[PDB]
Amino acid sequence: DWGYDDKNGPEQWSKLYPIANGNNQSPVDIKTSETKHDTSLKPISVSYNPATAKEIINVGHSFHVNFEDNDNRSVLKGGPFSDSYRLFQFHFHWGSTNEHGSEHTVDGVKYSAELHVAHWNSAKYSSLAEAASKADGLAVIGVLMKVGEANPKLQKVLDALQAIKTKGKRAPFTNFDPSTLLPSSLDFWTYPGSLTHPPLYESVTWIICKESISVSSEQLAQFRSLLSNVEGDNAVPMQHNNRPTQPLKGRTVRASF
């Protein structure tokens, strides 16, 4: 079983998942002096239907907000993509303290947390399960979260956590459009990469926003007070779930700006 502690964590993952030492691993440090501006990149277009919001789940290492993905009610288009990608989930990563917590870094700078909005290629594939292992199967928008002012758009999500405190708990989570969590500028970086935890498939086209969103110290505390243990066991707070940055191995990070 994999996690984030020292026995089962990022430095150990290569034992059952050798792709952890692959050539297209994520996250990465984005060095802005080494990025290549690409005039061919189109604007990012998101069109999400709040009716697709389904469920919030404590998954032990994190929590997930899942969406109905049976049709194209909620889609990502544009950027580097010719295909339409269907929303299926969003989640966050965070760290032990405010000083770290993001997965991607920019010129070496670590942010406090990171939002991931994940989609699958419904133009080419019939299901998430099919798409997840294909090079062009997944598209994830990453948004760096900078500690500062409380973010009111996080409210519904944070209010839901009291109902899913321990591992395996789940609740309906409905009528929510996660494009409300995105920054006002959708200027972005893009590079070919991977899932940031097992199974670590190199199936993700990353879209990293240039503009951060805010999160308060107390909002981050709410993430960290989720519990990784099952109900009735000794409490084990979910202190962190960010992977260290990985070698670019010659990949190019492109800029839309």
Residue ranges of the annotated binding site for substrate are 196-197
Residue positions annotated with a catalytic role: 61
Closest CA to 71 of 122, 124, 140: 122
Taking CB under 5 A as the criterion, which residues in 66-95 touch Zn ion?
none
| Residue 109 per-residue DSSP state | B
CB of 115 to Zn ion, least distance (A): 9
Name the segment binding Zn ion (CB under 5 A); options: 9-17, 80-88, 109-117, 122-130: 109-117
User: Which residues contribute to the annotated binding site?
Assistant: 61, 64, 91, 93, 116, 196-197
CB of 39 to Zn ion, least distance (A): 29
Helix (H) or strand (E) holding 144: strand 138-147
CB of 90 to Zn ion, least distance (A): 9
CB of 47 to Zn ion, least distance (A): 22
End-to-end CA distance of the chain: 41
CB nearer Zn ion, residue 37 or residue 193: 193
CB nearer Zn ion, residue 89 or residue 126: 89
**Which residues on neighbouring strands pair with residue 255, listed in sequence order?**
37, 189
Asked if residues 87 and 131 have their Cβ atoms less than 8 Å apart, the reply is no
Binding residue (CB under 5 A) for Zn ion from 64, 116, 119, 169: 116
CB nearer Zn ion, residue 115 or residue 164: 115
CB nearer Zn ion, residue 66 or residue 235: 66
Cα–Cα distances in angstroms (integers) from residue 31 to residues 35, 37, 42, 73, in the given order:
7, 13, 22, 36
Instruction: Name the residue whose CB lies closest to Zn ion.
Output: 116
The whole-angstrom separation of Cα 197 and Cα 214 is 24
Closest CA to 241 of 7, 1, 10: 10
The footprint of Zn ion (CB under 5 A) covers 116
